Structure 1
Amino acid sequence: TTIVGVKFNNGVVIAADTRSTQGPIVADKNCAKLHRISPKIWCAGAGTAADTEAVTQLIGSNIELHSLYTSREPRVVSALQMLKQHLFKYQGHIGAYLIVAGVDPTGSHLFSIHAHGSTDVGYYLSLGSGSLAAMAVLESHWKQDLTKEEAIKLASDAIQAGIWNDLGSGSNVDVCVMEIGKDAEYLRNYLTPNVREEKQKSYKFPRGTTAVLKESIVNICD
């Protein structure tokens, strides 16, 4: 993975690539690393894939119950607190590296969490194997008082740096914009700069090519 988070004028934006690996093999060419904790609190995840998904769902579930209990919209710091205490308790064995962002009644927020349970605060952040390629772009082009369109550009550019230069990242760019006073817009496959070229040949086999020993109808009904 490559994941980023960027703060702007009236909110925060996060982005991610869509490659999943098992050793040197690409397991998923278009996986979703942007996770919804609550309607306006989203999470970008790097590390052990199942851990990032499981920990984000558990906290997301408890956040919903908390929101219903308190009759309030959930806060980012609550998600942050619950995530870090959970991760700390497991002493790093739950390998989730998360960028937590969102808008709530307090304002807009951007945090990162490490597997061992340490949290950071920042205006721009990057995690994952391609975080160095991304951070290089962020350090070069980030400035105070970014607009919405500028932040999306900067965030996607940082992900692209990971896509092209990091072998642990590739395929597409997912984005999620969380602006204050508006609905969060999840931009699935915001960029798709890795479309597979037309194949040279069709490998459609002549019918009957495969040798068969037996046939039978399978019963799926009661």
Structure 2
Amino acid sequence: GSNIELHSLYTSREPRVVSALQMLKQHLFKYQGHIGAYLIVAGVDPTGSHLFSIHAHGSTDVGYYLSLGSGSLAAMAVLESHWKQDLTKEEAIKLASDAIQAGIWNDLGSGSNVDVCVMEIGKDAEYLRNYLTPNVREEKQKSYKFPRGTTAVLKESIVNICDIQEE
């Protein structure tokens, strides 16, 4: 991302997904899989909209729908069942979050919330942090707030965080 920004400034052009893809794969390949990064790279640029996957050893794949991680099989099952050509934005978000939910529920390595990011052509990318929150913890039966003075203390002291003082 740093090198892409510098490259964008050098070329006076908006960065391309294939540039990030190429820079990532060559870096990962060089480290022979020891950098355990498995990525799904997506974005829009002057060339159009793109979607790629990257594995730790440096291999890349193209597709209309992709999934990675321990819950990728649960997700891919949903994608293979419901994906179609010419999806709308609203349909794609739904399909994407449903694929993540499949992982959340059925995969122990996955859980909690669903994060989404939509990159549409000719628009600002919208990052939807905690798009879904289907795992809020229920209220506890009891409050475990202690009575003050419950813990036994030996010593107390003020810590000097300030600098050396004047006068």
Separation (CA, whole Å) in 2 of partners of 1:66 and 1:206: 59
Q: 1:96 offset after TM fit, Å?
A: 0.2
**1:84 offset after TM fit, Å?**
0.2
List per-residue Cα deviations over 1:93-130 (Å, max 9, x = no partner): 00000000000000000000000000000000000000
Write the distance in 2 (CA, Å) between the matches of 1:74 and 1:206: 58
| TM-superposition CA deviations, 1:3-29 (whole Å, max 9, x none) | xxxxxxxxxxxxxxxxxxxxxxxxxxx
5+ residue gaps, structure 2: none
**d(CA) in 2 for partners of 1:206 and 1:104?**
59
The structure that is strand-richer by fraction is 1
State whether structure 2 residue 124 is matched by structure 1 residue 183: yes
Partner of 1:212: 153
| TM-score normalised by structure 2 residue count | 0.97
Q: Distance in 1 between matches of 2:103 and 2:160?
A: 49
Quote how far apart the aligned CAs of 1:77 are: 0.2
SS of 1:217's equivalent?
A: coil
Equivalent residue for 1:154? 95
**SS across alignment from 2:78:** helix
- Structure showing greater radius of gyration is 2
Q: CA deviation at 1:216?
A: 0.2
Structure 1 stretches (4+) deviating beyond 3 angstroms? none
Deviation at 1:155, TM superposition (A): 0.1
Counterpart Cα distance in 2 of 1:209 and 1:221: 31
Q: How many Å separate the matches in 2 of 1:210 and 1:126?
A: 50
TM-superposition CA deviations, 1:8-56 (whole Å, max 9, x none): xxxxxxxxxxxxxxxxxxxxxxxxxxxxxxxxxxxxxxxxxxxxxxxxx
Deviations 1:49-103 (A, max 9, x none): xxxxxxxxxxx00000000000000000000000000000000000000000000
Aligned residues: 163
* Identity in percent: 100
Local SS of the residue matching 1:108: strand
- Corresponding residue of 1:10: none
CA deviations 1:143-195 (Å, max 9, x no partner) are: 00000000000000000000000000000000000000000000000000000
What RMSD, in angstroms, separates the aligned Cα atoms of the two structures? 0.2
Matches of 2:153 and 2:31, distance apart in 1 = 52
Which 5+ residue runs of structure 1 have no aligned equivalent?
Answer: 1-59
